[PDB]
Design a protein around this ligand. Sequence first.
Ligand code: HEC
Length: 81
Amino acid sequence: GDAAAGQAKAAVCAACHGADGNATIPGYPNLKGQNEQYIVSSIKAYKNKERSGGLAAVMQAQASLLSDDDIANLAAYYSSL
Ligand code: HEC
């Protein structure tokens, strides 16, 4: 994945995950520096609705907007922070 392409795509994500990938809403997760493969698999889990219920509903919607390339790029960006 291409971290610069990920940075471009992350504008929408920053409202909930923070400009720097540290979230500031209680209950919302930090992404900054998270394992790259884990970020991939976790966004794919939401896209496949293998995570459900509660705040997952929200990420299901977000994940459905992302192509497999976008997910790779986002993971490269966040893991690099
Ligand atoms: C609120 C309007 C959000 C937007 C926009 C984005 N995300 Fe999100 N994300 C949000 C919540 C509340 C949660 C927790 C959901 C849960 O199952 O409890 C998440 C979770 C993630 C994760 C998983 C993190 C983990 O540690 O397993 C990822 C990788 C993630 N979110 C990524 C992400 C991306 C890349 C976004 C822009 C396309 C994005 N989210 C937007 C809230 C919100």
